[PDB]
């Protein structure tokens, strides 16, 4: 059956301020999707048609620079995946000569080195996010309105975002992570009772490492599920309140930035949760196979 | 007094990492309540009686140092409150000689200076929170357990917290802020239609300022409401899940830190939301009075 982690896309990291989260899946920042959404907003205002060039030059380059940064950490990624494959697979551990304690410490060191690399190589890209944001605000000032800025475009997009939000079975995600977190706790509780009786070298270490990784991925799923829930609740609360006809231009700037980043979060968190969904299912199959091996060793002991 | 804000406790500020929130209400940080909760956890484990002294000395002193640090910003607070009372009250504006544009600018400068003071004077205290947290983690290592650490105390406290969580009407908080936010947006829209019809600049400026402050306080209410709901949902999710009877010592450490900080967030946010609820209501009374003064002027040509 399944016993080898082929993909470790589940690692992410946030910056020190916890404003930006870096993912191994492109566009790597949710903020790229906001720049894509503003391209849709700007097409309805002829006063800001220059953003078409800002998007082609600044926004696309930022995406590729983010992809380039992730690619710089690719050899750390392969080294980390090589350690994971040994630590999770007793058969692969038996083909080398290092001890499990040594490989475990190298795993923690390479894990933080890889995650640290994802952030460090993207710091200048993070600064570019603010500069393109400020460039967008300055571009928005060229609108031919000041205290009577129309909100039709703003309210048209909220309605469009609400139907896209219905295309995500939010109850399925809650039910899935609830069962998995309890299945995870039951697994660890079963391992605790078995270890109290026997020492099963290699096999028992492997199943604990996989469970430890499972716990990390569970935490990642809950994080990204909380953000997509928050984003949908905010946009929905706007649609259930009063709808002003006209606002000032500085207010319309905040409006576009508000719904634009919320839809970006939703779009970004969806593909992240889908990846994390597959990673959890994959880790569980490894645990299942290892657990059957562990019960066989328990029988021959007693 | 009529159209007079007497309390400006609604201002708060977070640190750059957004891990610590500094409030003008004692204990100024929710982390103090966690230290108070661990004092209850430690009473069930004779191996860690030393925390009785750590709490009495380090924790209480941190509270008093936090209170003193906030006190350093009192001169800025009085200046800021003085500007608020002028900007919100047309009668008090007419009794002085500064222009409304200059007073608005001084407000924005003093507001940021006061909020920045609340954080800057508390930076050493924020570091002391980390010292006490690490000292607690090191103290927990003295437990006479390794792979068989009982979770009886952990589950006894979760039961207690759930009873306390039900004493907070979350739906009342939600229904209030959503109706209040809608009334706020209607007030703004009403002024946009009204100001086109009359030249009442003194009154209109005061309404716009009070509504400007109302917007800030609404965002504060929403921030603290989200935190307290997250904390209740996390602790409730623990109760609805599998309940292992024994865990490892490092797992028990994270157990105590998890529910302790979540309950601390619950206690802290409740008193914050109650203060913000009163502040929003008081700002709305000022808007009601000013709208009544505005409609009176509209009647007389």
Author numbering:
A (entry chain B): 28 to 329
B (entry chain A): 28 to 328
Give me lines lifted from the publication on this model.
Among these markers, the P. vivax reticulocyte-binding protein 2b (PvRBP2b), a member of the PvRBP family of protein adhesins, produces the top prediction for dormant P. vivax infection. PvRBP2b binds to human transferrin receptor 1 (TfR1) to mediate entry into reticulocytes. We sought to design stabilized variants of PvRBP2b, under stringent conditions of minimally perturbing the solvent-accessible surfaces to maintain its antigenicity profile.
To determine whether the designs retained the structure of the parental protein, we determined the crystal structures of WHT2483 and WHT2484 (19 and 26 mutations, respectively) to 2.4 Å and 1.9 Å resolution, respectively. WHT2482, WHT2483, and WHT2484 had final yields up to 6, 11, and 7 mg/l of E. coli culture, respectively, compared to 0.7 mg per liter for the parental protein. The main surface change is the reduction in positive charge in a patch on both WHT2483 and WHT2484 compared to the parental construct due to the introduction of the charge-swap mutation Arg418Glu. Comparison of the binding footprints of the human antibody panel with the mutations introduced in WHT2483 and WHT2484 reveals that the binding surfaces are largely conserved, with few of the introduced mutations being within the antibody bound surface of parental PvRBP2b169-470. There are three introduced mutations which fall within the antibody binding footprints, these are Lys248Leu and Met324Phe which are present in WHT2484, as well as Gln378Leu which is present in both WHT2483 and WHT2484. The interaction of 241242 with Gln378 is mediated through the peptide backbone which would remain unchanged in the stabilized designs.
